[PDB]
Amino acid sequence: TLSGPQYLGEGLKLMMRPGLRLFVLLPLSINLILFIGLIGFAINQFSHWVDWLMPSLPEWLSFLQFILWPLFVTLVLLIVFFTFTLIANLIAAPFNGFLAEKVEVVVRGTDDFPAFSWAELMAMVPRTIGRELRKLGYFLPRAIALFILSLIPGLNLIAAPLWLLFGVWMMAVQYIDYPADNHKLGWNEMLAWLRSKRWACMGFGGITYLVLLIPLVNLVAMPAAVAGAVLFWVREGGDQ
Amino acid sequence: TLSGPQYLGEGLKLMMRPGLRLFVLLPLSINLILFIGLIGFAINQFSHWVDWLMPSLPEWLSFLQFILWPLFVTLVLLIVFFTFTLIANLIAAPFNGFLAEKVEVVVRGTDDFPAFSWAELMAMVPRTIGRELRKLGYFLPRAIALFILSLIPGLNLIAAPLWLLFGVWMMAVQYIDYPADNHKLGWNEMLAWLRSKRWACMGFGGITYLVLLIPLVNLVAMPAAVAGAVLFWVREGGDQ
Amino acid sequence: TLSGPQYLGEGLKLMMRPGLRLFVLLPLSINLILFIGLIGFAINQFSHWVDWLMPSLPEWLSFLQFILWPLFVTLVLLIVFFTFTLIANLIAAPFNGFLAEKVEVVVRGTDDFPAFSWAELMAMVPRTIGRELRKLGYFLPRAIALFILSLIPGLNLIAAPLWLLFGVWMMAVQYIDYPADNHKLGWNEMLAWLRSKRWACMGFGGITYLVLLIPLVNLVAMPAAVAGAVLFWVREGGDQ
Amino acid sequence: TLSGPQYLGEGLKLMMRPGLRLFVLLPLSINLILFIGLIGFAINQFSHWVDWLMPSLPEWLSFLQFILWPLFVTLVLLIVFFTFTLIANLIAAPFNGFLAEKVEVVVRGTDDFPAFSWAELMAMVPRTIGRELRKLGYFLPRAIALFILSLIPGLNLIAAPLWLLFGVWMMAVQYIDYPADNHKLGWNEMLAWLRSKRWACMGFGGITYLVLLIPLVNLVAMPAAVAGAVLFWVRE
Amino acid sequence: TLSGPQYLGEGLKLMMRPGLRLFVLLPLSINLILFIGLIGFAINQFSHWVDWLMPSLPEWLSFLQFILWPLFVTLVLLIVFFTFTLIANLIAAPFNGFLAEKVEVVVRGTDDFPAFSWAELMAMVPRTIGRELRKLGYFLPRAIALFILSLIPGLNLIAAPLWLLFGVWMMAVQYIDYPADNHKLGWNEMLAWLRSKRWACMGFGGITYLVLLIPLVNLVAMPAAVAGAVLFWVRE
Amino acid sequence: STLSGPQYLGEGLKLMMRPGLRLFVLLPLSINLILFIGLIGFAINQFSHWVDWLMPSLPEWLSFLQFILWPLFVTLVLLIVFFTFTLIANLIAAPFNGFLAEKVEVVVRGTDDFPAFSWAELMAMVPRTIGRELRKLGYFLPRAIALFILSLIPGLNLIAAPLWLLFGVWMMAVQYIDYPADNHKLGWNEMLAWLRSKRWACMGFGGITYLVLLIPLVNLVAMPAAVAGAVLFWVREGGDQ
Ligand SMILES: CCCCCCCCO[C@@H]1O[C@H](CO)[C@@H](O)[C@H](O)[C@H]1O
Ligand SMILES: CCCCCCCCO[C@@H]1O[C@H](CO)[C@@H](O)[C@H](O)[C@H]1O
Ligand SMILES: CCCCCCCCO[C@@H]1O[C@H](CO)[C@@H](O)[C@H](O)[C@H]1O
Ligand SMILES: CCCCCCCCO[C@@H]1O[C@H](CO)[C@@H](O)[C@H](O)[C@H]1O
Ligand SMILES: CCCCCCCCO[C@@H]1O[C@H](CO)[C@@H](O)[C@H](O)[C@H]1O
Ligand SMILES: CCCCCCCCO[C@@H]1O[C@H](CO)[C@@H](O)[C@H](O)[C@H]1O
Ligand SMILES: CCCCCCCCO[C@@H]1O[C@H](CO)[C@@H](O)[C@H](O)[C@H]1O
Ligand SMILES: CCCCCCCCO[C@@H]1O[C@H](CO)[C@@H](O)[C@H](O)[C@H]1O
Ligand SMILES: CCCCCCCCO[C@@H]1O[C@H](CO)[C@@H](O)[C@H](O)[C@H]1O
Ligand SMILES: CCCCCCCCO[C@@H]1O[C@H](CO)[C@@H](O)[C@H](O)[C@H]1O
Ligand SMILES: CCCCCCCCO[C@@H]1O[C@H](CO)[C@@H](O)[C@H](O)[C@H]1O
Ligand SMILES: CCCCCCCCO[C@@H]1O[C@H](CO)[C@@H](O)[C@H](O)[C@H]1O
Ligand SMILES: CCCCCCCCO[C@@H]1O[C@H](CO)[C@@H](O)[C@H](O)[C@H]1O
Ligand SMILES: CCCCCCCCO[C@@H]1O[C@H](CO)[C@@H](O)[C@H](O)[C@H]1O
Ligand SMILES: CCCCCCCCO[C@@H]1O[C@H](CO)[C@@H](O)[C@H](O)[C@H]1O
Ligand SMILES: CCCCCCCCO[C@@H]1O[C@H](CO)[C@@H](O)[C@H](O)[C@H]1O
Ligand SMILES: CCCCCCCCO[C@@H]1O[C@H](CO)[C@@H](O)[C@H](O)[C@H]1O
Ligand SMILES: CCCCCCCCO[C@@H]1O[C@H](CO)[C@@H](O)[C@H](O)[C@H]1O
Ligand SMILES: CCCCCCCCO[C@@H]1O[C@H](CO)[C@@H](O)[C@H](O)[C@H]1O
Ligand SMILES: CCCCCCCCO[C@@H]1O[C@H](CO)[C@@H](O)[C@H](O)[C@H]1O
């Protein structure tokens, strides 16, 4: 009855109520620390990194340095961004998993005020980081496939839609995974599960993608998305 | 003999001969009268309608009115336009049906000079208005669907071609129905009928679409699209 | 002697050195709190806002509520975004201003390690906030002008360049004022004085804007722009 | 007095009152007849025209006919439009002029119910047809100029604004003329009269442009623009 | 182990070795002689073609010849180019096959080098020219179709990819045909063959497409494509 | 005298068509042939290597970037190869154009309707005419890079497209109308002043010359036509100093 994007909205509701409300701070804080620590580092090495990527040129081709400069400078940033993002989700991987349990007990009425402890969090770290690596393995190859498909002057027009649709579906697997993996469910079994809910989890993943495009709101958005995903897992069925 | 778009042309021929020659003036004359009557009222009401759609705003945001004015003024115009066409087509519905019948008797040779009588027209009105409503009910949801699909950044590129192709298929169903409905044929039965004749009525629909973009020529073109569709019905199966 | 976009570069150096590094953490924490506070506010009021703007309609026009809904949701979003920006800048105004003085004493050689104190910061707040209000009062009119010029289908092509040319100039008056305002210097007087350094401060503002197009940069760049602007005030004319 | 375009708006008020707008239905009904005639004609001869325009080609180049077919067809269509747009406006020239007088007596209070008689219309025809022909002469060179400039890849960017600004300015000279021409004023004297105040005509013609973009509303926007122009002639 | 676009590279290698390096010169010589004569021809007759294709208009409509001018000029140019491109490749058709055979024997170790003889080339000419005429018969209708498809306002977006995919596929059928036609390969069986090998021959055809986008490098790239197509024929 | 505008290029094509000047049309093509035939092989063998030079060395983790970085440098390299080639070819065409311009002049002035080609005087021209094309490049490439950097700015590109076009036309005037002018020991600055006084005429000439040189197979006939047309522009409009 709740199928579609409605879950996301409801997930936000689940985050606003006390005792789950303070867990919302986790992603931002991660990205905060990771930013502040890394930013300074990046600041010092930015100049050096481009100097490594740029080839040595003779005096006659030295003019190419003017055209090649903006490139690697862009590329470095593109790397520094992606690298950071890559780490952020990794450090955010356990917390989200830990959250997906704590949301669930509230969804079913078991304990409306779940408690945070580092013990069970550190105990979750390996399966949930490894699971973040499985997600990365499922995503990144297909991403490079669609992107190289888009670099072709003829074929990009079919790549833009495939890109979008895939990114939505990935919003389904990324977040609905957290309760599925917390129920020790196989990767294949969960992807088949989402394949059976493809319309529902495509709507959920879709509005999740959209609301996750808002830059500052990303950080309040993700916890809502996790909780909404847990709700998805409870309202669709955890039989597998 | 004629398969493909050729029917439209032949429809023109049929409308050129005496006795069917004046009905070409029915659509044009309708849109004249309709406009002449409505324009007046519209002029007075237009100003008010936008003020209604425009939100009531506080002092600091009042500058937004300067930017919201064009949008709402645009929107109302669009609505004011569609309504017009929507009403016009409705009023054009029976006259078309009455033509598709009267063209048919000429195509099959029963009466070389059919007469116009308001009696059987008014007798037609409720059913034919009902069918134009069934057509709008078929079209408007799929149209909206395509449009929402166009506002999606990734999927818009797949939205344009689908819009064209559907608008063509719709040109088949709008006009080939007039004789089919005159023959008391089920809606789904005609849609499957045309789905088996996909190519033929997709060609007829195609040229009918193109020619009916030409702005004022529409009102002379349409009766040709009717007669042409009656020909599509006569020269191809009347079987049910 | 020392000139061009290099100021920004040099300004960055001043921020990295022992004694001036932690001041960069002042705006971020603010933007954190300001975000954390406002975002929750937005979360709760969002419905009421989009419902306020939306007009009350009769039953048959109720379908319009579907087209007006995304619109207002966007509009509200934009307000929420711009309002945030507007507030953020304002709160950033004194921390910027307070910095422009503290950078200065480091540039001159009195004290290599300045200390932060809430007393004189709070003593600065009203003057500097009123200052940046003078800035918004100088900027927002010319901005609205160029924007009404760009809405005209014909003139919009000359609006894009005219936009950029002003945006670079603005970069000068925003930052270079911070030390000047600490020296009790008049608004129109500073406008006249910088009207002479137009080229230098336009290079400063040029690299300032471009370098401000990157997201990572901004959080570390505004301090670099403030320090570089202080440096610009010291090595060139402080005369009055 | 009335800043920017209010004249058009005020002009529309004038047209909506009974007595000043049955006059609107006159040229429209004619252009209807014109429309019906020209369309039927083109129906009969469209094939003759495209076969005339198409060159005779060999069997190896016969497939070229397949690319030439859409072309002349387009071309014929275009001519057919412009001819009509040209003729209709031509036929519209006197009625508008005849209206511009009949508007003025209502503006100044002379006669609240103007009388329509074919006599004084036919008497206007030569002067007002000549006058609209002068307007076509002022317009077409600068229009072709901007179109050719707009074909240029680099300079096309300067052709789009110059197009709009001209298309707006022209809306002044056509309409604000109808009263001036009724006052027996020289062409050059009127262009100096309009260039005397650029902003005013620029707003009047500006909204008149935008409002003449609305598809069926043209038919009511034009009369408004005439009377507003009459109003524009009287108040200033 | 060698599948994919690598064949292109390898074909290049085969053409670098002595005795096969003389085979590179002929397509260049064809484009050269043919080009020089046909271009001198083009300059004198151009005026007659554009004047021939352009229709007779009355003197009022005379101005239309100004818009039709850039068009027909363009059109003639396109014909001029296509005709050249049409003829050019025809004359290269047998030299290709005659080359293809001489490459195959090098792949299997049969021949270190063969002295060219006009005899066997002339013996090939009618069959292989009939073969490339059949290639034109497969190609040109799909192209005109895709072009009419690109004229459609909605479907033009689906025309852009459809072109490329076919342009690549054609580059498979064009070159991999030449060894096939050396073996009297029946038309249906080769098209099915390349349809069963879609990935390999489509990558081969792909790099062939792209490297053939390079203008003067076309001339050295085509022999590499022929050699690569023979290797594609032998190893799979 | 009445011949002002872009008509010069047409008339120049006419001059190249009459006997005595007709085979000089083959001077550019042959050049572009030879320069290609010599270079082509070299380039191919070393193309693979050049991209590998410009491409950065990346670790195990950043190796995937090679999939996106590869096509880039390959294009970049190609571009350079093209520009450099077109650079070099134009240099070799510099004396021939000048020589042709000189020879065209005697046909235009009715002195010798069938001028003879001799390697003596062409080789005599080489140093002057090359140096003068180096000056042409010096006038062009800085201003061109300026327009390109200006087009890189997000706000100002819209003003970079027209400026680019107009400057390209103007450079057509400078390049071709210079050829007769250099033959009469005319200074660089003073010819820029003279063309600046003929800006309407030579800007039309440079306009059609530009367009005709955009068509690839046609440009081989048009380049001589542009030289001759430029000689006629020099003859019919003051060659005075
Ligand atoms: C756009 C730049 C945003 C701030 C982060 C990178 C700033 C790098 O800045 C530079 O760092 C170099 C060492 O890496 C020093 O040599 C320079 O003096 C310093 O200006
Ligand atoms: C403000 C920054 C917004 C960028 C949002 C882009 C969303 C990309 O998508 C994400 O890429 C990540 C790796 O980078 C993976 O961890 C995720 O599984 C994948 O969904
Ligand atoms: C991660 C933050 C996600 C916010 C997703 C919000 C989805 C909101 O959903 C909207 O909220 C309103 C609630 O009153 C409803 O009236 C609307 O009909 C509903 O679409
Ligand atoms: C474009 C001109 C449209 C004409 C407006 C309507 C018909 C003439 O206008 C008015 O219409 C009224 C009813 O609306 C009639 O009662 C009046 O007799 C009338 O003059
Ligand atoms: C273009 C000039 C005006 C076109 C018609 C204006 C409509 C006039 O007004 C309309 O008709 C009656 C008066 O005529 C009024 O009483 C009606 O209330 C109004 O709807
Ligand atoms: C869809 C047709 C509407 C576009 C034409 C112009 C509408 C402008 O409507 C304005 O409303 C005013 C309010 O009374 C009236 O004085 C006039 O009707 C007019 O000035
Ligand atoms: C293109 C930029 C804005 C053009 C001017 C918009 C003026 C908006 O002003 C509007 O005028 C209307 C009456 O004329 C009123 O109904 C509105 O309430 C008022 O906001
Ligand atoms: C596209 C048209 C915009 C929708 C708004 C239509 C007007 C809705 O507003 C309506 O206006 C009427 C007349 O003023 C009033 O009688 C009604 O009380 C009011 O509901
Ligand atoms: C004042 C009444 C509201 C505005 C009327 C909009 C009527 C538009 O009507 C449409 O105009 C098209 C051209 O635009 C024609 O091609 C169509 O045949 C016609 O249905
Ligand atoms: C940019 C900030 C986006 C805010 C999206 C907020 C959507 C959630 O909204 C919140 O949840 C309720 C539903 O339970 C809504 O009715 C109210 O807006 C609010 O309480
Ligand atoms: C097609 C564009 C329609 C815009 C309609 C604007 C008319 C709004 O309404 C009118 O605005 C006038 C100002 O011109 C005022 O003088 C009138 O009192 C007012 O009724
Ligand atoms: C095809 C039908 C054409 C209709 C043309 C209507 C001509 C207008 O008719 C005029 O109307 C005036 C009041 O408006 C009266 O004052 C005039 O005496 C009358 O001639
Ligand atoms: C369908 C609604 C009425 C149809 C009749 C309109 C006849 C056209 O009318 C004419 O059209 C020309 C070009 O659009 C205009 O320039 C003329 O002023 C106009 O009189
Ligand atoms: C450029 C192709 C040929 C010209 C086509 C446009 C013909 C119609 O053009 C219009 O006719 C009116 C007559 O009054 C003029 O006043 C208008 O300004 C003019 O645009
Ligand atoms: C083959 C014949 C094609 C000629 C069709 C006549 C088109 C006249 O159509 C007119 O176009 C105008 C815009 O220019 C619209 O604003 C008018 O409402 C409409 O009447
Ligand atoms: C249609 C009349 C002009 C000829 C159009 C085709 C242009 C050239 O077409 C080419 O022909 C070559 C062989 O000639 C083939 O190798 C290519 O696959 C093909 O693209
Ligand atoms: C209306 C007829 C349209 C025919 C267009 C076909 C023109 C041939 O297009 C061909 O495509 C090849 C790659 O695909 C290129 O290598 C050739 O240069 C080329 O001329
Ligand atoms: C690179 C080698 C140059 C050969 C190309 C043409 C140069 C010679 O050109 C020829 O010179 C003859 C007399 O010498 C003239 O009579 C010919 O008309 C002329 O065409
Ligand atoms: C960004 C668009 C690039 C188009 C292709 C390269 C155009 C510039 O090309 C250059 O023009 C110069 C001036 O005459 C010549 O000196 C150079 O030889 C030539 O390479
Ligand atoms: C050494 C291999 C590099 C290849 C560079 C060749 C680029 C050739 O360039 C082409 O040459 C023709 C004249 O020669 C011109 O007609 C074309 O405009 C041009 O694109």
Author numbering:
A (entry chain E), B (entry chain F), C (entry chain D): 3 to 242
D (entry chain A), E (entry chain B): 3 to 238
F (entry chain C): 2 to 242
Q: What does the paper behind this entry write?
A:
The CysZ protomer is an alpha-helical integral membrane protein with two long transmembrane (TM) helices (H2b and H3a) and two pairs of shorter helices (H4b-H5a and H7-H8) that insert only partially into the membrane (hemi-penetrating), forming a funnel or tripod-like shape within the membrane. The protein has an extra-membranous hydrophilic ‘head’, comprising an iris-like arrangement of the two short helices, H1 and H6, and kinked helices H3b, H4a, and H5b. Besides not resembling other transporter structures, CysZ mediates sulfate flux into cells or proteoliposomes without coupling to ion gradients, partner proteins, or exogenous energy sources such as ATP.
We focused our analysis on the best of these (3.4 Å resolution in P63). The refined structure of PdCysZ comprises an entire hexamer of near-perfect D3 symmetry. Antiparallel pairs of protomers arrange together as a trimer of dimers, with the three-fold axis oriented perpendicular to the plane of the putative membrane and three two-fold axes between dimers of the hexamer. The hexamer has a triangular face of equal sides measuring approximately 75 Å, with the perpendicular span of about 65 Å. A surface electrostatic representation reveals a hydrophobic belt along the mid-section of the hexamer when viewed from its side, outlining the orientation of CysZ in the lipid bilayer. In the structure of PdCysZ, the entrance of the putative pore appears to be closed by the network of charge-interactions by conserved residues, R110, E106, N184, H185 and W235. Following this polar environment, the putative pathway widens even further leading into a large, primarily hydrophobic, internal cavity encapsulated by the TM helices of the PdCysZ hexamer, located in the plane of the lipid bilayer.
